[PDB]
Amino acid sequence: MKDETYYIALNMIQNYIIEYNTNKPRKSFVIDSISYDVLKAACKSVIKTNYNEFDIIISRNIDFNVIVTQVLEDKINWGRIITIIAFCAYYSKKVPQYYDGIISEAITDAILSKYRSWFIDQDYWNGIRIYK
């Protein structure tokens, strides 16, 4: 259910999706701004490297949530979290609707429905700092 962990996940993702779409800095509206900056830099790198492939995927018009849930079917790791967020942020801007939170909610549910204790054991977003 929507407990402390849920909102730690959701509000990080939603503020990143807002920054990606508005190009306004959002690090000051999350609790863990150091991990936010890592997420932002990592997402930027993934998009810069893979945007053409993202375009081809997106052209199929398949529901983004069907894709996200398949990415996390077997295992989770920080690379998969980063890549899901980057892909969904990229998709959200080629198409404002992201303020409704649906994308961020879907990613959060996909992570926490199966990997809640993994995420807590990572000290929430702190675990992403292996990429700093």
Partner: peptide, 22 residues
């Protein structure tokens, strides 16, 4: 089904190689 699995594999490739480099 398959196409959404094929897409997921593409993103998992990106993710898992990203994880490997960094």
């Amino acid at each position: 089904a398959r196409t959404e699995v094929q897409i997921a594999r593409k993103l998992q490739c990106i993710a898992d190689q990203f994880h490997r480099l960094h």
